[PDB]
Design a binder for these strands. Structure first.
Lengths: 183, 95, 184, 380, 183
RNA sequence: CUAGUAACGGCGAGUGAAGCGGCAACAGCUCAAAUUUGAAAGCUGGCUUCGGCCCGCGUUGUAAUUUGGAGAGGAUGCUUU
C-alpha cells in the first residue's frame, strides 16, 4: 500500500520534501524540450488513478505551457492546451487524461497519459479497447477529456441548466419555432 | 547425416573462376635416401645454413639417412602448412 | 589492503594442515594397500596457498614446484608417506598403459645432463643415456607399465610433464584416466 | 547522346577488394576468414588490377562478386548472429549470477570441447562445395593427411583432446575399411614421414603420416585457423567413410570398447560385424613385432594385405597374439636392433616395405639384419 | 572551446544540485548507505533465498505433473514489490528490509525508513536498485524484504539483523534528522 | 405542458428558464484506493513441422477478487455451469 502514502504526500506539496523535489525537477524540465517523452510518471499514484497502466501501449508525455492572461481571458484552460499540443505531436495515439506535475513563474507543467489504439495489447483488453473505436479520435479537441468536461459544465443540477446537455444544443432547441400539423 | 545428391545437374564453370594451382608432386629430391649424385657437398650445406631463411631457391636440401629411427621429423612442418594457408587465402593468383 | 577475513581464513586453514599432518605422523608412514605393487601418476593440484615446510620439500623431492606438472612414481613403504603428506595439493591414482602412451608420445619431453631439451630422435634417446636397456620410447613405458628394476634410473632421466590446462573440466582406482583425458 | 563514369561501371562491379568484401558482408575481420574457408571462396586476380580499382596495390587481394553474393546468401550468417548472442548470453548468467542458467545455456551451446562433434552444421556447405564422390576421394588427399598429422599432435586451446580422440577414432575408421577391402597398394617413406597410396573405385588417394613423435610447433602459427581444418576434415571423412561403409554393407558406426581401448589396443580395440595379388601376399603368414619396430605402420600394412596373425610386445600394446618369443608359431619376427630361434626368421621392417612394394617377396638373405641395407626405390 | 551534449551536462548538474542544495532530512538520509562488508554479508544470506526463475519454476511444475501421471512445506523466498513489501511492513511480517538509494521518483521510498522505524523492523538503505533486481531476477527492485527463513539459518539472519541495528542504525541515529548539503 | 411564469432588466427596448405532471425509449457498468505472496498466476513480438519453443514487457505492478444503497474473509448448506 505504498500509494496511500503518496496520496497524502501530494496533498502537502508546500512541505519541505515536496517543495524541494518540485524545485529540482522544474529546473531539470526547463532545459528539456517543450514537449518530451517521460519513461515513467513523476507521480505514479496520480497517473494510475487516472488510468495509467504499465503495459505496452501506455506512454507518458510531459509538456510545459505558458501561464498568464491571454483583459482578455482564454476560456481554454492551460490543461486543455497541454492536451492539444501533445495530440498534435502524437497523431497516432489517443489522449486519455492529464494531470498537474509542476509549475514555475512562467510555465506550468503537465503530464499526459496516452494509449496506442493500434497496439494489440491494447486492442485485446476490454477495459481499454473502447478507445480503439473511431468516435474517440482526438478527444482533447472536442472537449471530451476531464479538463474539457469541466470547462463545458457537464454537471447535474440547476446551476448547469444551460450547459449540461450541450450548450449550443440547448440554445438551438430553445430558439426553434415548432409548428405541428393540427395547430 | 543424409545423402547429398538427391538431385544433381552439371554446372558450367564461369570464366571468372580461377582455381588454385596445385602443389608440385614429391620429386626425387625429397627422399630420405637419395643417390650419391643428389648428395651435396658439406661446404654447400654450411653455406646454405649461413644464408637467412626465405632467401633460398629451395627451402630444403637432401641429406642421406640410413635407418627410419635416424630420420627426424621436420621442424617447419606446421610453418610450411601455415605458409600454404596464407598462400591460398591471402596471395592472389594471376591467370 | 588485505581484508581481515583473509587473515582468519589463513589461520583456520593452517591449523587444519597442522592437525592432519600430526595424524599422519601419529599412526605410521603406511597406507592400507594390498601387497601387490602398482604404479601411481601424480598431478599437481591448485590448493592451499601457504605450504608448510614438510609438504614443500616433498614437492621438491617429487620435482613438483611449478603448478600442473606431473611425474610417475611406483609404490614403496616410503612413497605412501609422501602420498598422504602432499595429498591436498596433488591428485593420485593408478593410470593405464595407453595413458602412458600419450604421455611419452604426445606429452613427452626430455631431460639430459641438467638442461631440458625436447625429445629429438630415437638415437637421441640413445644419446641421452640409452644404455640400461634403453633403445626406444617403449623403454620408459616398460619401466612404467611394468615395475622396473631401473625405473628409479628411468625417473632420473624423466622430467615432470607440463600437462595442458583443461577448459571447464582419496585414491582414484582408474578415474585418473579421465584426469589426463581432459588435461592432455 | 549521354555519358557515364569510367570508374563507376564495369570492372569495379565484377571484382572488389577484400576490404570492400568484408564491409559488404558486415562481419568482423576474423569471422570472414572462417566463413571464407567454409564456402571455398578464393581471391584470384583480374587481368588489370589498376583498371578494377585505381588506388590498388599488388599486395592487395580482390574477390569475386558472385562468390560474395553466395557468401551473403548462406544460412551460416544467420547462425553466426544467433551464436554471437549466445556467447553474449553466456556472459549473462555469469555476470548477474546464475550457475544453473549458465549451465542450461551452455548445454544449449553444445561447445566442441566436450562433444567432439562440431559447433556448426557443415552439411549444406559441403553440399555446395564438392560436386561428386570422386572429388571427395580427390579431396581425401588433403583430408586424411592432416588428420593423421593432427591425431599425432598434442592438444591446444583451439583443438581439444576430445577432438583429437575423435580424430584418432576417425583415422582408425578409414584404416579398418582399408584392411578389409585391401585397397592399399603402394607405400613410400621419406624425411617428412610415411606416404600411403590406395585406389578406391579407380581413384588414387595419397596421404602423409609422420612418425609417432611429438612435433615442434615453434614459430608463428595459427591454431584457430588450424582448428577449423580439423572441423573441415572431421565432417568430410565422417561423410566419406559413412558412404563407403554402407557401400561395403557393414554396420555403421563400428562398435567400440572403452577400457579395452584404454589398455592400449590402438587398432585392435574394435569389433566389426559384416551384416547389420594383395590377398596372396602373406595369405598364411605369422608375424611378430619387437620393441623397437614401429607398431602402428607395420600392423596397418600387414592387415591391409591380409596377414591373419600379427603379434607384438605387451608394452607396445595388448589384445594380440601371444607375446612370448619362445612360441614357435611365429614365422617372421621384425627386429631393428644394433633367443636366436631357428624356427623364426630374423628380419627388418624394410624387408616388409620392399616386399610390399615390388610384390615379389624380396629375399630375407639380402635383407638380413646386421648387414648394410641395399638402397630402396620410390614407387612414384 | 569544446561543446558538451545536452543530456551529458544535465546528468552532472543534477548530481551537483542533489548533493549541494539544502536537502530536507528524508532525502539526506538516503545519502548514508551501509558499508561494503555489511552489504556483502547481507547478500550472502539473501542469495540463499533467491526466488525461482521462470526456467526452473516450469521444470518443477513438469516434475509434479509427471508424478501425477505415474509432501512439501511453505517456500521461503525473498519478498519484493513495493506494494507487497509495504503491506508486509504494516502487518509486522517482515524481519529485515533493504531499500534502494536511487529510486528516481524518490517519493516511493521516502516514508519507508520511517515506517520501518515506527513498527520496529530493522532497515538498511543499500546501494543499487539494480543490485536488488539481480537478487530477485528483474532489471530493477526498489525494495527487498525477508520475512521468514528456513531453520538451517535462523541464527545468521538474527546475526545479520543485529549487525544492522549496531553497524548501520546506530550511526544513522543522530544524523538522519539533520538537513543535508549546505554552502 | 409548465410559460411568456420565476428571474434579470438605459425596469425603455425587452430578454427569459427550471422543478412537478402526461408521454417516447429504457440498461447498466469499469477502474484507483488491499499482500497471489503457498509460488506474474498476465501480456507484445519472432521462429514455427502449427504442436509449442525463445526474446522482451513487467514488481516504480501485468492477471484473478472488489467499486460505498457496496464489499472482503471465515463458516455453513442448498442452488448453478
Amino acid at each position: 500500500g505504498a500509494l496511500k502514502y503518496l496520496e497524502e504526500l501530494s496533498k502537502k506539496k508546500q512541505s519541505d520534501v515536496v517543495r524541494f523535489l518540485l524545485r529540482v525537477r522544474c529546473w531539470e524540465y526547463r532545459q528539456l524540450n517543450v514537449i518530451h517523452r517521460a519513461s515513467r510518471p513523476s507521480r505514479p499514484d496520480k497517473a494510475r488513478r487516472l488510468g495509467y497502466k504499465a503495459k505496452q501501449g501506455y506512454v507518458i508525455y510531459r509538456v510545459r505551457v505558458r501561464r498568464g492572461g491571454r483583459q482578455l481571458k482564454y476560456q481554454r484552460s492551460l490543461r486543455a492546451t497541454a492536451e492539444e499540443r501533445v495530440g498534435r505531436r502524437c497523431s497516432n495515439l489517443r489522449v486519455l487524461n492529464s494531470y498537474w506535475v509542476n509549475q514555475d513563474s512562467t510555465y506550468k507543467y503537465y503530464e499526459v497519459i496516452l494509449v496506442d489504439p493500434n497496439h494489440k495489447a491494447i486492442r485485446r483488453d476490454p477495459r481499454i479497447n473502447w478507445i480503439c473505436n473511431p468516435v474517440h479520435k482526438h478527444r482533447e479537441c472536442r472537449g471530451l477529456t476531464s479538463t474539457g468536461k469541466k470547462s463545458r459544465g457537464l454537471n447535474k443540477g440547476h446551476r448547469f441548466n444551460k450547459t449540461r446537455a450541450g450548450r449550443r444544443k440547448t440554445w438551438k432547441r430553445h430558439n426553434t419555432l415548432s409548428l405541428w400539423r393540427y395547430r | 547425416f543424409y545423402d547429398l545428391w538427391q538431385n544433381e545437374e552439371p554446372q558450367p564453370p564461369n570464366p571468372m573462376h580461377i582455381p588454385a594451382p596445385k602443389l608440385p608432386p614429391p620429386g626425387y629430391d625429397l627422399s630420405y635416401n637419395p643417390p650419391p649424385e643428389y648428395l651435396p657437398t658439406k661446404e654447400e650445406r654450411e653455406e646454405w645454413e649461413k644464408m637467412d631463411p626465405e632467401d633460398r631457391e629451395k627451402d630444403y636440401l637432401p641429406t642421406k639417412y640410413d635407418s627410419l629411427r635416424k630420420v627426424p621429423a621436420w621442424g617447419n612442418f606446421v610453418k610450411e602448412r601455415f605458409e600454404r594457408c596464407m598462400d591460398l587465402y591471402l596471395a592472389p593468383r594471376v591467370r | 589492503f588485505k581484508r581481515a577475513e583473509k587473515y582468519v581464513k589463513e589461520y583456520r586453514e593452517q591449523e587444519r594442515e597442522k592437525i592432519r599432518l600430526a595424524r599422519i605422523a601419529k599412526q605410521q608412514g603406511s597406507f592400507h594397500i594390498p601387497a601387490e605393487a602398482k604404479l601411481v601418476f601424480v598431478i599437481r593440484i591448485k590448493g592451499i596457498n601457504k605450504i608448510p615446510p614438510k609438504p614443500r620439500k616433498i614437492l621438491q623431492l617429487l620435482r613438483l614446484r611449478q603448478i600442473n606438472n606431473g611425474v610417475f612414481v611406483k609404490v614403496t613403504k616410503a612413497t605412501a608417506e609422501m602420498i598422504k603428506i602432499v595429498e591436498p595439493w596433488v591428485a593420485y591414482g593408478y593410470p593405464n598403459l595407453k595413458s602412458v602412451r600419450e604421455l611419452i608420445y604426445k606429452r613427452g619431453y626430455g631431460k639430459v645432463n641438467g638442461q631440458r631439451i625436447p625429445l629429438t630422435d630415437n638415437a637421441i634417446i640413445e644419446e641421452n643415456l640409452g644404455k640400461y636397456g634403453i633403445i626406444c620410447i617403449e623403454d620408459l613405458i616398460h619401466e612404467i607399465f611394468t615395475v622396473g628394476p631401473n625405473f628409479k634410473q628411468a625417473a632420473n632421466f624423466l622430467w615432470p610433464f607440463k600437462l595442458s590446462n583443461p577448459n571447464g573440466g582419496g585414491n582414484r582406482e582408474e578415474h585418473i584416466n579421465a584426469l589426463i583425458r581432459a588435461m592432455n | 547522346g549521354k555519358a557515364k563514369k569510367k570508374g563507376k561501371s564495369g570492372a569495379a562491379r565484377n571484382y572488389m577488394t577484400r576490404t570492400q568484401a568484408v564491409k559488404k558482408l558486415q562481419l568482423s575481420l576474423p569471422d570472414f576468414r572462417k566463413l571464407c574457408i567454409w564456402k571455398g571462396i578464393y581471391p584470384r586476380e583480374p587481368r588489370d588490377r589498376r583498371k578494377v580499382n585505381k588506388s590498388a596495390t599488388a599486395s592487395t587481394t580482390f574477390y569475386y562478386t558472385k562468390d560474395i553474393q553466395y557468401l551473403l546468401h548462406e544460412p551460416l550468417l544467420q547462425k553466426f548472429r544467433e551464436q554471437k548472442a549466445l556467447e553474449k548470453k553466456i556472459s549473462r548468467a555469469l555476470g548477474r549470477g546464475d550457475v544453473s542458467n549458465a549451465a542450461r545455456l551452455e548445454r544449449n551451446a553444445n561447445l566442441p570441447e566436450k562433444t567432439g562433434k562440431p559447433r556448426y552444421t557443415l552439411n549444406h556447405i559441403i553440399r555446395e562445395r564438392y560436386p561428386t564422390f570422386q572429388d571427395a576421394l580427390r579431396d581425401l588427399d588433403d583430408c586424411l593427411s592432416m588428420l593423421f598429422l593432427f591425431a599425432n599432435l598434442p592438444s591446444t586451446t583451439a583443438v581439444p583432446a576430445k577432438m583429437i580422440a575423435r580424430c584418432e577414432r576417425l583415422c582408425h575408421e578409414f584404416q579398418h575399411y582399408l584392411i578389409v577391402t585391401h585397397s592399399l597398394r603402394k607405400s613410400f617413406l621419406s624425411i617428412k614421414g610415411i606416404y600411403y597410396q590406395a585406389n578406391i573405385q579407380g581413384e588414387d588417394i595419397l596421404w602423409l603420416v609422420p612418425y609417432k613423435f611429438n612435433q615442434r610447433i615453434v614459430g608463428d602459427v595459427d591454431f584457430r585457423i588450424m582448428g577449423t581444418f580439423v572441423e573441415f576434415y572431421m565432417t568430410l571423412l565422417g561423410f566419406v567413410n559413412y558412404r563407403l561403409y554402407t557401400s561395403i554393407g557393414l554396420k555403421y558406426p563400428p562398435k567400440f570398447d572403452q577400457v579395452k581401448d584404454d589398455q592400449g589396443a590402438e587398432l585392435a580395440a574394435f569389433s566389426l560385424e559384416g551384416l547389420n595379388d594383395p590377398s596372396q601376399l602373406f595369405a598364411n603368414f605369422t608375424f611378430f613385432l619387437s620393441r623397437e619396430t614401429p607398431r602402428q605402420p607395420l600392423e596397418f600394412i600387414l592387415r591391409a594385405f591380409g596377414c591373419k596373425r600379427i603379434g607384438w610386445d605387451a608394452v607396445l600394446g595388448e589384445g594380440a597374439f601371444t607375446t612370448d618369443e619362445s612360441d614357435p608359431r611365429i614365422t617372421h619376427q621384425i627386429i631393428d636392433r644394433p633367443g636366436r630361434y631357428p624356427g623364426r626368421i630374423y628380419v627388418q621392417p624394410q624387408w616388409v616395405w620392399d616386399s610390399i612394394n615390388d610384390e615379389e617377396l624380396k629375399p630375407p638373405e639380402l635383407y638380413a639384419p646386421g648387414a648394410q641395407l641395399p638402397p630402396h626405390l620410390s614407387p612414384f | 572551446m569544446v561543446k558538451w551534449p545536452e543530456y551529458i551536462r544535465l546528468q552532472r548538474q543534477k548530481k551537483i544540485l542533489r548533493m549541494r542544495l539544502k536537502v530536507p532530512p528524508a532525502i539526506a538520509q538516503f545519502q548514508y548507505t551501509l558499508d561494503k562488508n555489511l552489504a556483502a554479508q547481507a547478500f550472502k544470506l539473501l542469495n540463499k533465498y533467491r526466488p525461482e526463475t521462470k526456467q526452473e519454476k516450469k521444470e518443477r511444475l513438469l516434475r509434479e505433473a509427471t508424478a501425477i501421471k505415474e509432501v512439501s512445506k511453505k517456500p521461503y523466498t525473498v519478498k519484493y514489490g513495493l506494494n507487497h513489501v509495504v503491506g508486509l511492513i504494516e502487518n509486522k511480517k517482515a524481519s529485515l528490509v533493504l531499500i534502494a538509494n536511487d529510486v528516481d521518483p524518490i517519493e516511493l521510498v521516502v516514508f519507508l525508513p520511517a515506517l520501518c522505524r515506527k513498527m520496529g523492523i530493522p532497515y538498511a538503505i543499500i546501494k543499487g536498485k539494480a543490485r536488488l533486481g539481480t537478487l530477485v531476477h528483474k532489471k530493477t527492485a526498489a525494495v527487498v524484504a525477508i520475512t521468514e527463513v528456513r531453520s538451517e539459518d535462523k541464527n545468521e539472519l538474527a546475526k545479520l539483523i543485529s549487525a544492522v541495528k549496531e553497524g548501520y542504525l546506530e550511526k544513522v541515529e543522530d544524523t538522519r534528522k539533520r538537513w543535508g548539503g549546505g554552502i
